[PDB]
Every structure is written in structure tokens, then in C-alpha cells.
Amino acid sequence: AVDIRDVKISFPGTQNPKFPHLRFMQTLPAVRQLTVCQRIKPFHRNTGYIFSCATSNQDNQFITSMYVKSDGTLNLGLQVNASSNKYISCPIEIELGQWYHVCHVWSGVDGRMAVYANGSPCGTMENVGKGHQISAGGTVVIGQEQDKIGGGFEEQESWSGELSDLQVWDEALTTHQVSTVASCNGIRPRGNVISWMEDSFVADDGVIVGISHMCSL
Amino acid sequence: AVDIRDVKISFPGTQNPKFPHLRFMQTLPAVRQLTVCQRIKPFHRNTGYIFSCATSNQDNQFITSMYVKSDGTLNLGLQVNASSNKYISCPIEIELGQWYHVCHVWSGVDGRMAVYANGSPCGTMENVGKGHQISAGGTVVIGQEQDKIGGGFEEQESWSGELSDLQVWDEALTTHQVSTVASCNGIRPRGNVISWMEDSFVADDGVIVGISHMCSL
Amino acid sequence: AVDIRDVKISFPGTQNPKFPHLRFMQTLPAVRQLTVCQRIKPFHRNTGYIFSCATSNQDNQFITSMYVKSDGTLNLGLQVNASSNKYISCPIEIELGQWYHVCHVWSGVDGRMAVYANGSPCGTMENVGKGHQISAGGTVVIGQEQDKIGGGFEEQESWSGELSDLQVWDEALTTHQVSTVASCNGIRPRGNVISWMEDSFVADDGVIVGISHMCSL
Amino acid sequence: AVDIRDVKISFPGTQNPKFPHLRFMQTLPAVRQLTVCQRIKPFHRNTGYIFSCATSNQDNQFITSMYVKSDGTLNLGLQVNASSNKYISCPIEIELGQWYHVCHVWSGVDGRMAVYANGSPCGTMENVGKGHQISAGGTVVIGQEQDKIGGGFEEQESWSGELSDLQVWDEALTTHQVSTVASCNGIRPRGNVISWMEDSFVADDGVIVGISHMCSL
Amino acid sequence: AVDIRDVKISFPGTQNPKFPHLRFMQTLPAVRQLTVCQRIKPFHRNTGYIFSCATSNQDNQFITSMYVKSDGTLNLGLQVNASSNKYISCPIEIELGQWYHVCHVWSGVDGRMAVYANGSPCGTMENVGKGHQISAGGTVVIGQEQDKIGGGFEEQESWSGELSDLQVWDEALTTHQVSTVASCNGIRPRGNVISWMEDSFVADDGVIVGISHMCSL
Amino acid sequence: AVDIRDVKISFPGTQNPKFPHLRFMQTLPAVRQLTVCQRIKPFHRNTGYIFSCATSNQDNQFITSMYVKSDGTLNLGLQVNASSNKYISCPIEIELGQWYHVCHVWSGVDGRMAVYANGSPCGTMENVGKGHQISAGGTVVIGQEQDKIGGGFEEQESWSGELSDLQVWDEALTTHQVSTVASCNGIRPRGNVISWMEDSFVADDGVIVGISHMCSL
Amino acid sequence: AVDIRDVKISFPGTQNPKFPHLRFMQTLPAVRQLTVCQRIKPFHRNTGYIFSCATSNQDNQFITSMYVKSDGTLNLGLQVNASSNKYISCPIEIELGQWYHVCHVWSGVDGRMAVYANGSPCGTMENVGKGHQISAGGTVVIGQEQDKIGGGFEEQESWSGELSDLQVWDEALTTHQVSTVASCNGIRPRGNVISWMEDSFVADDGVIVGISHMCSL
Amino acid sequence: AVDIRDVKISFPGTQNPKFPHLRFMQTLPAVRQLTVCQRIKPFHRNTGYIFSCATSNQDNQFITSMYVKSDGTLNLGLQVNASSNKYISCPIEIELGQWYHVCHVWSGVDGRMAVYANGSPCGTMENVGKGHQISAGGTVVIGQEQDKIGGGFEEQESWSGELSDLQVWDEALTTHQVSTVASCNGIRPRGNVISWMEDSFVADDGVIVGISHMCSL
Amino acid sequence: AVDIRDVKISFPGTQNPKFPHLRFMQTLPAVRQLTVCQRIKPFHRNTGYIFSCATSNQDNQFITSMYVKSDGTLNLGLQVNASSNKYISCPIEIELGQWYHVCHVWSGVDGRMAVYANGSPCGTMENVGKGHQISAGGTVVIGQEQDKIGGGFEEQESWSGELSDLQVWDEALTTHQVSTVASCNGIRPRGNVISWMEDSFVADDGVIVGISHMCSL
Ligand SMILES: [Ca+2]
Ligand SMILES: [Ca+2]
Ligand SMILES: [Ca+2]
Ligand SMILES: [Ca+2]
Ligand SMILES: [Ca+2]
Ligand SMILES: [Ca+2]
Ligand SMILES: [Ca+2]
Ligand SMILES: [Ca+2]
Ligand SMILES: [Ca+2]
Ligand SMILES: [Ca+2]
Ligand SMILES: [Ca+2]
Ligand SMILES: [Ca+2]
Ligand SMILES: [Ca+2]
Ligand SMILES: [Ca+2]
Ligand SMILES: [Ca+2]
Ligand SMILES: [Ca+2]
Ligand SMILES: [Ca+2]
Ligand SMILES: [Ca+2]
Questions:
Q1: Is G112 an 8 Å CB contact of chain E?
Q2: A126 is in an annotated binding site
């Protein structure tokens, strides 16, 4: 009946010392490219970090984030190897509490960054982590921004809302491929690095496990 | 590929002030009967409480527990409306770290208690909560014993190990029905009160979300 | 998913002035024979009337009842045209709170009465309403005994428990046919006089609408 | 043959001390969003409350209602956390005694309210329960307006007519999803909070259980 | 081979003391709406009553009739609670001896009357039995007009011809639903109040039982 | 759903001037053999004539009958060309009100008579209408014995009970063929002379049209 | 392989005392309407009678005939109750030796006559046997005109050619229905009064039994 | 529905000058072997000739016949090229009016004759038309014995009864093959010389065309 | 793999005393119409007779022939009852050595002749054997013209080439039917008089048996 890809996690809200988050048990391998796709229902307009990857020597190896502009426009950001946050605007009005499919595509081979909203390209940006290779052993945390491996969280950088169908590949997916990932009734692909609910993660500080009805009612 | 019924939660180990546990978001309705079935992989021989249900006036409405005797024999216990713990031994040697299907069947209509290990009856006991009806609004916690709604946990009463496929019905399932519930390749029924991964729950204090390989490799 | 034949009604318990019951909206046609089959989960051992049919001139046209003997043996009774209650014992131990399929077969053509438990014949009795034809316009009430059309209920004659799959035919089904009616995975026949959930009925005094798990979990 | 989703309940008419209604046995979990969809056949033009949710400290947590304007236009109302009733008109002429699919979509995350008639959007309204989260333990009553948990009904606020296929989700369904819910020959989705005939409810004061022929004859 | 819905009854012709007719064995439940559909082959142009429903205190609860105007136009009439006969003309030329599908839709909730010929709407009429509810226990006679329960027939009000596929619902079917009922190769729906050949009836005064070839040759 | 072969006719009881019966519209062709099979539920033990065939010059061309002996044994009789009634006893105890399949096989070619109960041979008799050929134009009446074409009925020769699946062939079916006719879940053959519900017949004096549940519930 | 509906009979030619013909063994029931359809291959242009029905008091109850006009146009005639022959011309050129589907539709209810050639309407005629009902017991002869039951044939009124697929109904088929009867690859319907090769008939005076290749080669 | 192989012909009885018979339109080719199989229902015990083949110079080329001995035993005869009749008795009691499958196998190559009853071998005979080859142009008549091509019939040599499924091969079928021919539910083979209803024949002197119910009811 | 309908016979060339030909073993029945269709590959332009039918008193009962005009145009001829050869030109250029489907349609009923090339009509001719009926017993020879039964061949009238799929019916097929016969991928019909390779024939004077690749390679 209910597919495992539709399981969702709710990140209630953050307030020191409570930081709802997930931390994947297995560290990532070294990667030269990364595509992070997932379904999200944001609870606030201000900036929040969703996917955070940190190594012993670099707490900011790869970090995705978002925020909603005053006009309701979605802004997707990416930070690689402690670079400044690179933002790309998406031509879609965000209604807090509604579901959206978001994907960040990064390639250190050519330094190209691209983001997608609901399976459609929002635009690209050059010189983002160009020539950079994320060293092996990266620890992934969801919902909080790491300043130390698995910790050093800050409430102003947390992301509250609901998340599901997190899929990560160590390749830079094409525009066409991202649309096949977003499709609710599509093949619903599984990442080779992280496949939602197939790669163990620690749940802490009151996250809520439930079901997402973005695709199936 | 992977069925949502095979999702598992690991309860690492308890040590104040850390109490890994789950708390279901929705309270239970009033019930005169209850059957709690689930797959478990115990980490220790000493007594631990698995399913704990509490109301404002009675923190001990319904509590399941287990422990392994010196000879390796499984003992399943039940406590209803603050009664003493009633234990029924099962003719099966327990190996910590291995999977077992356990089910507790309770009927307040006739006061009969029955427990099952791997789909087979271990025995029954009379006068357990006879004539008792669990009042509406019971809060369910997994892995810890409540002394207060959603809290008042005690390390000596915690249960560590892995749990999956939790199914709860507000009826007293028959011996034959329990065997159809336990079967790995059977129909894998879903409880009408609580259906694993279909009824939201809060995850806290470091529980680990993963996949159970008791049934499917 | 869930079949309408598995919908159940719970009759909580009776205490003046509260009499949980059902009353069918349409009166029955004249009949010379009647077979009443249904799934029941009794809450008490003392006598209770399940199916009650009354006309303006005869509040006791056809009434089914049951009670459990001291040894746990099931006793099924029938009363036709204000006759005395005729009881036939069934070779099955009743556990209050458990499901059982019960059927009463009556034929006014030859005056024969026969009852069945879980699809098996318990025995027969002669001279029960022999030559009697239930006059047209009978009102059917479930869970209470009528002393007046749709009323005049008495607490000591009420039946508490859960009921489901009520099927009524204006024929006297054979022993073989009743076994095909009882089978949980059988064709699950629908009565031509009353078909569960296909013939409207008034629900009153706190009956609970839910699902029966006697057949499907 | 007949699907459980087509079972209907008739609310005859209210007159103190008789208040036909349904009360769900299980209280709701805490929610920040809610979508209530159902098929209704109204018996009167004046205002009536259909879905009423109340907690110990707030009898008016969430209440749906409707009324027909002088020109026959349908007006759908919603009240959250004791706010005033917010009404949105639907471009459809109502004929008392005819079936219509109605749905109320509420999101406390952004405070947006939206209503649908026969699967089509009627319009939206801002600032309805914005930032409000319905506290856990809400009791749901159908057909009457609660002034106390499960009671305190008032004849002038009751709703008479026929109701079927009640489905409730703790999410704010999109315009497209509501159309898939309304379709008679569609997938006929089941709510995750309340699924018609899958979540027990008490029937009282003469409600009539029957079959709806809005979709299947 | 031959479906039961195609069985037909021929009403030869009436002449005191012979009144060919059918009388259903079971009385109807109370209804606030009624839809009567059937296939008919009229033998005469003058007015004849087809469906007659009577209670102890009202011999004219619900009566359908028809007649052919001078120009061959079909006129369908309805009388509710002893009101005057309300007629609606149908844009179809009637050839005595030919088959036609006729349906009468009545709603006491809004007092709306609508008739259909061969699955197409002929028109509607307001204020027909508005607010009227047919009391329970109505006796249905086909082919004759009752002035007394099951009798008091009058030759000048009888209807001669062939009739088949009589289906009655206690709801006011929509225009679209009536077209699905009329279709010869459609689903051929069965009424919930009266389903042709599934609800017993007395045949008297020389009616002829045969097969209708309106739909299948 | 319901097959036309399961339609049944009830012959309530006879009392001058009321003689419930059926009369086939079409006369039979000349035949030198005849097999009459049907399902019957007898209401009385005394002799009654079921199938009566008469021509202008011979009201007793072919007549079937039955009666139950004191010990409950079934006796099947046949009369051809005004011969005396020939009876053959069947090894089966008859319970009034129960269904039985009965068939009469007659061959004027060799003058052999054979009867069957529930598809099994009861025995045979020689010299019954040997060399006799039923002249063309025979009128068939069911439930009454003709002393004149379509009339001259006598209450003491009437047959009361329920009848269904009447099949007549102008051949003398073999013992094996009769068993294939009786089988409830068999091919359910249709006679070439008279096929139940496919050959028109007049219904008179209050016969009741309904459904037989001998084979399908 | 070969369907029974394609069996054909050849009427060689008539010359006293030889009159090739068929005579149905069973007489017809009383009818107020009649539709006679069949496939024919005419051997001559002059008038010939195909279907002849006679009763003791009326040798000309119903008679069909045809003839080819000088320009090759087909003329179909009908005579009812000894009326004069009514002819309707068909817009089709007849080639002796070729197959054609012909059907005569008659309704005594309204006195309308209609004929069809190859499934298409040729026209209609009023006042043909209006109000007339063919009395029961009509004997049918094919290929000759009866002046006496089964005889009194006249060579100048005989019809020579090949005939197949004779289907007769006691209803007045519609224009659309006749087209479905004529279609060679259609459902090939069977009449309820006479079904080709399913209703026995005497063959006499040298008719030839063979196969028709009008539809299947 | 009805297969052409089940069409039957009835030979009523012979009485000069009336000789019911069939004569095949096409003469046979020269053959050195012949197998004649068919289903028959005999009307008399005395000798009758069924299949008669004659050429200009030999009216007795091949003739089959039968008769029933005093003890009811079937005797099958064959005559080839004016030889004396050769009889082989079959171990089966014949009941006039019942169906039997009979087959005659002849081989002029070795002069062997073999007959079968109901698919079983009755025995063989040597020196029957040994070395004889039936000359080309043989005319086949059924039911009468030819003394001249297509005529010269004699009442005392006629065969009365019913016949169906006549199949003729110009080969000497084996014992096993004859059993596959006789089987009612088998492949029902068609002869290469004469295939029932596929080879034209003249019907004369009152034969009756109908349907055989030996195999299908 | 290879269908019997594609078997071909090659007629090498004729030179006294060698006359390659085929002679069918069985003579034809009497016919009033005849259609002869077959596939041919001609080896010469001069006239040749393909199908020759002769009786004792008429060696020229029915004869088909062809020849190619100077411009390459195909001419098809027919002779009936010793009439002169009637020729109809076909709008197709013939290439000796190539395959063509040819069919001759003759009707003695109206005296019409029609020929077809490759399934298309070439034209018709009147007064060809009008009123003539080919007497029974005709012997068919292929490839030579008979002046005596099965002989009297003349080299100047022989036909050389390849022939296959010879199909003969005793009916006059329509234009449409001939097109369905010619189609290589069609149903490939089989004549009822002569079916290629299903009706035995003598092969003599060096004909060559092989396979035709006109339709299947
Ligand atoms: Ca950081
Ligand atoms: Ca930080
Ligand atoms: Ca506690
Ligand atoms: Ca504790
Ligand atoms: Ca009483
Ligand atoms: Ca009482
Ligand atoms: Ca309130
Ligand atoms: Ca209130
Ligand atoms: Ca009246
Ligand atoms: Ca009146
Ligand atoms: Ca008599
Ligand atoms: Ca009598
Ligand atoms: Ca005449
Ligand atoms: Ca005449
Ligand atoms: Ca002879
Ligand atoms: Ca002779
Ligand atoms: Ca010649
Ligand atoms: Ca020559």
C-alpha cells in the first residue's frame, strides 16, 4: 500500500537546546559531483539549511539551503568547501505549508551549479567549487547546519518543515533526468549515495515520523 | 522494492538523561481488548518494557515486557491497569541479536491473556484485567516505561534492541490469526489501531531508523 | 480494501433509559420460513435477544437469543409466535470477546428449527411454529427485545457485544448452505430479505460503528 | 459489490432533546493543517455545522458549515480556534435533496483557507487561523456543533441531510488533489486522519445507516 | 443467456371483474425521495396508471401515469399525496406497441418533479409534494390504481401493455444517472427499493410472464 | 447476478374459487416421448398434480404428481392418456418446505416410465402409455389438474408449494443426463419444448413471483 | 465450423401434385405483433408466398409474399386476417439467384406494417390488421399458401428459391433492430417464436437441405 | 449455441405410398473401403435398412441394417455387392426410443467387416465383399432400401426412428478411431465422403427436422 | 508451416499422346449455379481450357478458358451446355509465367456470367445458359477439354501452366465475396463443391506436384 519513498520527517521548530535533526550513520565516499533531490514543505520564509555535509577539517563541505523572498519567490542556495552561499532564484511562488520538489545539482569537474523546482530548471551558476573534490568521510546532517561533525548547531540556521523522498547521487544529473526524479507518478528513482529510508540515520530532538501526501493521497 | 513494513527502529541503549523512545502522536480510543504484535531483536536478557500505554489517571494502563531466563527461555509479560506483571514462558531459546516475532493478546471481556512467539502459542493466563476497559486517550510510548504521560522514564525499565512491523488491533486475535500475522511471507496484516509507519510517532534521544532483514534480505 | 460485509456494530451495554439498538427502516414481507445468520462477539453469558421481529398484534413473531451455560457451552434459542423459548445446545466452548458465526434456521412449513455454530449443525427441534406464517409488516430490531413496535425494551433481555455480516433469507437454508455462509473466505452470501449494510436501519442509544476482524485482519 | 466508501448516514432533523449525530471514538492528533472532504445531500438552506472538533479548553477548534443563499448559491464556512465564521461562495446552484462533493482545506502554516464544490475551487481566504496549531486530543462530532466535548448541542446549529465518504487528512491538499478526491469514478482516496467507515464512531439519536447512490446506482 | 432484467409482464386489458396487476409482497420504507424507472410498451393512448403506492390513510401516496396526446406526443404524469396529477410533455412520438424507457424522478425535499423518456430529460415541475414524506408501509401495485390497499381498482384507470426492468430508488437520480439507467447496453442498474425480479410480487388476473426484446433480441 | 433459471413461483394454497396456477401460452407439438424436470418445495404431504397437459378430446394426456407416504417417503406419479396413476417410490425422506429436484421421464415408444429425485434414479415402470403418442395441441397448466382445457380445476388435486427451473424435452433423457440436469452447479440445461422463463405463461389467482435459493444463496 | 443458422432449404419448383414445403410441428401462440426475418434467394419474378400462417377458422391469418416488378424492383407484401395484400416497394434491384435479407414487421396494436431489404427500411403502411390479434394455434407453412391447415396448396401461389436463417419474434422490431438482424457478421439473433433449426418442421415434396453461403463462404 | 452436428431427422413410419427418406444430391466416388457412423434412436425391433447405396447395375452396393433380438440384444447387419446380410451381435440391450451410436466399418481390401455400438467393438466378420470395389456413382438413400436408384422402396425394409450426426469416410477406421467418433464430448469428427449437414440431401415424404439431445441437452 | 491451399500442380505442356491432366474422383451434384476460382500461372497466350465438366449426354456442360490478346490483355471465357464460348476482357496485362487469381461466376437462374481477375470484376454477360441446370453426375477434368467422360482430349485445347487453390461453390458468389476469395492474406475460403486438396483427383501424364509461392514465399 504505502511506499517507503513516501515516509516523511517533520522538523517541528528549533530552540536551543533542542535541535531536531537527522544524522546518517554512514559517512559519504569521496565525490567530485553531487545531486541532492528531495520533497519539502517549508514552515518559514527565512533561510534554513537542509542538507549539511562536514568532514573533520571542513564543516562546510557541501550545504544546501533555501529562503523565500519578499515577493514569495523561492531562492535556492548552495555552499561548497566553505565558499560563500550561491543563490539561484526560481520562478515559483512559495506557499509555506505546501509541497515542492527541490533538487541541487553540483559538479566540481566544471564548477557548475544548477537547481530545480518541481522538476524544472531555475538556472545555473559557474565557478562553484570548481576543481574541488569533497574528501572522503563526510558526515551528513539534515535540518541543521554543522559547525562540527554531527553538532555545533545554530537555531538561526536550522530548517523547519516536512521532508521526504531524499535521494542523493554522486553524479551531476541532467535537466531531463531531474524532471524524471520529480514526477510524482514517475519511476521515483533512488540515489546511489543516499536512498531515502534505505540508508540508516539517527533521529533526534523530537522529529516526527509520518507519511507524505504530496504524491499519493 | 523495500516495503514500509520492514522499516526498523534501533533503541541503542539507555542511560539517564538519554532515553531513546518513540511516542505516537495520536492517543488511543477506549478499548476492551488489545493485540500488540511486532518483530523484535533484543539486546539484553534483563527485563525491558516494549509497549507502554498511559492515561492521565493511570500511567500503567497496558504494558508489555520481556526478559530471558537463565536457561535462555523467553518470558513475555503483561500488565493491565496497574496489576502485577503476569508472565508466560515460551518454549524457545533466545539468542540476543536475533529476530523473533512476538505478540501479546489481551481481552478485558473475559480477562484472558495469551502470548505468542514466532506465530506459535506459548500459553494463556486468566484473570488479567478482567472487566477492565482501557479509558480513552491513552498515550503510547515504545522502548520506555511511562510514569507520566510521555515521560518519567527509568533506565532499569527500558528496552534496547531493534523493533519493526508493530501492528495493534483493538480485538483479541485468535491463535490462528496470530500465526498469519507472524508469517514473513504471509499477508503481513496491518493493525486497525496502530499500523507500522502509517501512524505518526515522535522519535527522540537517538533512535536509529533503518531496515529490518528478518523477513526480506 | 475493506468490504461492507465486515462493518460491525458494537452494542456497549444496556441500562435504562439507554438501550443501544438498530431498527430496520423497512418492514418484512409475510414469510413461512426464515434463516438468520450473522457474526457475533458476545460480552456476557446471560441470555440476550439478538434478532427481534414484531407486528402490531404480536410483539414476539420471531426472536433469536443465546446464553452460555456454566460449563461454557453455547445455547441458541428461538421463539416463534409467542411460543416458549426453544433451546439447542452447541458443542462449542464460548469465550466472551471472541467471534463466532451463528445461524438460526426456521421453517413454518414443517415446524422444524435448526441452529448452527461456526457453520456446523448443533441439532434440530420439531414443532416450532408449525403451520405458522409470520404476518406481513414485521419490524426488526437488533440488540433488544420488542414488547411494542420498535420499543418497550427491557435491560434484562438486551444483548451486548459486537455484530456483523447479518444476512436473512425467507427460506430454510440447508446444512450445506449454512456452511458456505459461515466460511470467512467463502462467497460470503447476501440474504434476500436483509443484506448487511444494504438495507437501511436506524442506529440509536450509542451503538458503535466499526470494522470486524473476524475474517479479515 | 457495494463499497464501504458509499455507506451513508442520514441526519433526519433535530429537535431538542433529540440531536442526531456521530462522535468519533478516537481523538485527533495535534495538526497544523487539515483537509475535510465528504459527499453531502443537504435538507435545508439555513446554516448548519457539519464537522465539529473540540478540545477541553476550546470547543471551537475547527468547524465546517454551509448554507444556501437566497439565489440558491452555495456558501461554505470555516471557523478555526473560535474565530468568526469565514465564508466563501461557490458558483453552483444548490438543489436541496441533491448530492454534492464538498471539501474544506485549511493550513495554519500560512493561514490559508480554500473550499471546493464538486472538485472545483470556489476561492480562498487569507488569515484564517494563521500560526494556529490545533492541540492534540480533539473530539470530532458530525451533524452538531459542540459547546462541550461530545455535547452542548443546539438545534439552530445542527445540520440535517445525508452524508457519505468522509475523508480527513492532516495536510492541506492542492487544488488538483481535491479534484481527484471528488471524482466518483476516480481512485476514491482515504484520509490518513479519518477514513470513512475505517475509524469507529458512535451513532446516536436516530441517525439512519444506508447506501449513497451519488456515485454508484 | 437471458438476463432476469429482461423478464416482462403483459397486462392484457382490463374489464371488471378482471384487473390484471402485480402487488409487491413487501411494503416500502418511509421515503422523502423516489425514482421509478422501467421499460414499457403501451397498448392504448388513454390515461393509465402504472405505479401505484398506497398506505392505510392515503391510497394516493405516489402514482405514475401516462397518456398519448392527439398528435402522438407522450405525456408523463405524477401524483403525490393525493395532489392533482402533474403532467410533463415529452418531445417523442409514441407508437403503441413499441418499447420506451420511462422514468419519474421525485424529491419531496425540494418538491421537484422530473420525467425522462428513453434516457433524455423531458422537463421539470416545481411544487410537487414539497415537504412531503411518504409514510412507511406503502403497498405497491403495478397496472392498476389503488383506492384501497391492494384493491379498489377501476377499469378507466388501468394500464395495459408490456412492462419490464422496473427499478426503484429512494433517491432523486440526476439527469446523467437516468441516462445510464435507460441505456440498453449500459450497466443496467438495480434499484435499492425495488429491483426487478429480485423483490417478490403477487401476479393476478391473467398477467402474462414472458421476455422483453427491447434491448436483447 | 441472478439467473433467470432461478426465478420461482409460489402456489400459496387452493380454495375454491381461487386456484393459483400457470398456463403456457403455446400448446405443445405432438410428442411420443417427454421428460419433465423441475425444482420443487412441497407444502403438503397429500397428492397434488404439478404438470397437467390436456387436449380437446383428452384432459388427461400427461399428468405428473407426488405425495409423501406416512414414513416421509417421496412417491412420484405419472398418468398418460387417462391411464391410472402409476407411482414409483423414491428412497428419500421429504421435509415439507425443503427443495428437491424431481424429474419424470416417459417414453411412449417402449412404454417405459422412470422418475428421479435429486438427480438419482428411483426406479422404472413398464407399460405406461405404451404405443401412445400425445396428439398435437396440448395445453399445459402448472399447479392444478385440468378437466377441461385451462380449467375445471379441483382443490383436492391442486399442488401447493414453490416451483422453479421447469425444463421439458420431447425426448426420454437417460439416467446420466438427468443427473446433469439436477446438478445445482452444473450446466443447468434448458428444455427444447419448455424452457423456464423463455416460454410465456399466464399467471393467475395469486401466484407469487420470487427467487429460488435452492442452488444460489 | 458451419453454424446451424446457415443451413438452407431449397424449394425446387412447384407442379401439382408436388408442392415442396415445410410445416412447423408446433402451432404458434396468440400474438398481437409479429416480425418475420429470413435470408432468401428467389428463383422467379412472379408473386410467391413465403410465410403462411393459418388457423381452423382463418387460413389467411398472416401471409408474407414478394414479387419483382418489370424494372427489377423488389415488392414485399403482407396479408393479415384475410385482408387484401399490402405491398411496399424496396429501392433495390433484384437479381434472381442472388441472396437478400428480407424482413416483415407487423403490429396489430397500431396496425402498422414495415418491410426491410438487406437491413434497410423500404417504407411503412398504416391500417394493416389494426386491432387484430392472431388467435392461438396458428400452423406455419413455408413455401406454399395454405387454404386449409397444412394444405390446399396452389402452384400459382408457391415460392421457389432458397431460404435460410428464418427468425420470428412476437414483437414489432424497430428499424435499428432489423439492421442488427440482417448483418451477416453481426450477432445473428434468434427469434423467440421460431428460431431457425431449433423449432422442428416437416420437410416434404423434395425440398433440398444444404448450406447457405450468403454470409460465410 | 446449437451445433449443426446435432441436427436430427425423424423417420415417422412407413406406409405405402408414403416412404420417409433422404437422398443425397451427390453420388459417391468409387471406394474400396467405407466407414458409416451415426447416432440413432430406433422405433422398432424388426429389421430396417438405414444406409442404402445403389448404382445403375447394382441396387445393393452397400446396405446397413439393424434389428433387436428377442432378448433385447442389438444386431447390426451389412450387405455388400448383393451378398447376403451379414450380422454381428452387440453386447448391449436396446431400449426403443433411446439413443445409441452405431458404426459399420468395411474394407474390400481384406474383406473384413466390423461394427461398433456406443464406440465399442462388437466383433468382426471375414469374407464380406472381399476384393470388391464399389463402382463410382453410387446414390445414397437413408431410411429406405433401394431396388432402383432413389426408389423402389418397400415398407418391410424401411427404418423408422431418429437419426443424427451421419459421418462417412472412404477408409476403414480403426477400433480406437471409432471410439473417438462416438464420444459425445469428443472432437466429433466429420466424414470426408459425407459430413452431416455439409452434404446436400433431398428430404421427402414427411421426415421431421429437429435437434438431437443425445449429446447436448 | 506450408498450407495445403498452396499446393500447386504444373501442367508441363501437351503433345499427343501425352495429355497432362487431373480428373476428380467424385462427380458433381446437379447445380443451377457455379463459381470456379483458382490461382493460375499461364505458360502460353493461345486459348486453353482450364476447368472442364462433362456428363454422358453432354461433354460440354461447363468449360472455362482463357487466352491473351495481342496487346497482352486477359480474356476469360465460359461455355455452358455446349453454347458458344462467351468471352469477357479483363483490364490487366498478362505476363506469362506470373500468378493471377481468376474466377468465373455463373448463374443459370438468371443466365448471368461474370469473371474476375485478381479479385476485381472484369465485367458481365447476359443470356449464358439461362434456365439451364447442369445435370447430376458431371465429371471434372483440369487442364484438358473433354469430348468424352475423362478423355477425348485435344492438344490445341489444352492449358499449360501452374495451378493452385482451386475452389468451387454451387452458388453464384457476389463481387464482394470474390474479392475475399482472391486476397492472399485473407480467409482463403474453401469451396463446398470442390475444395483444393480435400477432394480426391487422379493425376496423370506427368503433372508436377509442388508448392505455389503466389501468396507465401
Ligand atoms: Ca558550519
Ligand atoms: Ca553554523
Ligand atoms: Ca509506570
Ligand atoms: Ca516506571
Ligand atoms: Ca416481547
Ligand atoms: Ca420484553
Ligand atoms: Ca461551540
Ligand atoms: Ca453551540
Ligand atoms: Ca386511488
Ligand atoms: Ca381510483
Ligand atoms: Ca382431468
Ligand atoms: Ca380433475
Ligand atoms: Ca389461403
Ligand atoms: Ca390459396
Ligand atoms: Ca434393393
Ligand atoms: Ca427392396
Ligand atoms: Ca468437348
Ligand atoms: Ca474437344
A1: yes
A2: no
